[PDB]
Structure formats: C-alpha cells, structure tokens
C-alpha cells in the first residue's frame, strides 16, 4: 500500500469532484463530500480533492500498477474538464 499525490491549479474543482460520484458511480463505491471524491475499486483507492481553485489527487494501492492506475485515471479527468494541454500535473512516485 503505497501513496502518491498530484497537485494542480484548477477553478471550480469541488464540482468536478462531486460530479464524479454521480458520473462513475454506476457500479462502484463513490463517496461525495465537500472535500473530495472517494472511489475504491476494492484492492486499491482513488480520492480526489477539489477546492474552488485547487485540486489534489491521492491513491491508495498495494501495487504500483493499481497505484498509477488510480493517480493517472484522475489526471485524465482534470484534462476533460480543461481542454488546452495534457493537464500539467506533477505526480509523485508514491513512496515505496
């Protein structure tokens, strides 16, 4: 169970987080709080922090494959909501 964190500067983020639980919450456990969107696939996790001007991405996974699968999946969501470039996001190794 390693943990990485991506930080990006986005506006109205909190909505893209709350909209995810309603978006992908079709066959998975998606929690919606005024802080982040929690979506666990079982043997891992993918949380998304979103404030009016900033967004955080944290994943909880026992394996990097999973780990990156989560930290990356989000990097994509920020891209759909921000058309201009491949979301400038700095992803951390996620510790060892």
Automatic annotation (TrEMBL):
Pfam families: DUF2218. This is DUF2218 domain-containing protein. It comes from Pseudomonas aeruginosa (strain ATCC 15692 / DSM 22644 / CIP 104116 / JCM 14847 / LMG 12228 / 1C / PRS 101 / PAO1).
């Amino acid at each position: 169970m390693f943990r990485s964190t991506s930080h990006v500067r986005t506006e109205s983020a909190a909505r893209y987080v709350n909209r995810l639980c309603k978006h992908w919450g079709h066959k998975f456990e998606v929690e919606l709080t005024p802080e982040r969107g929690f979506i666990d696939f079982g043997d891992s996790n993918c949380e998304l922090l979103a404030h009016p001007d900033h967004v955080l991405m944290i994943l909880n996974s026992p394996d990097e494959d999973s780990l990156a699968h989560m930290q990356n999946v989000v990097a994509d969501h920020l891209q759909r909501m921000a058309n201009s470039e491949s979301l400038e996001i700095a992803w951390q190794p996620a510790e060892s």
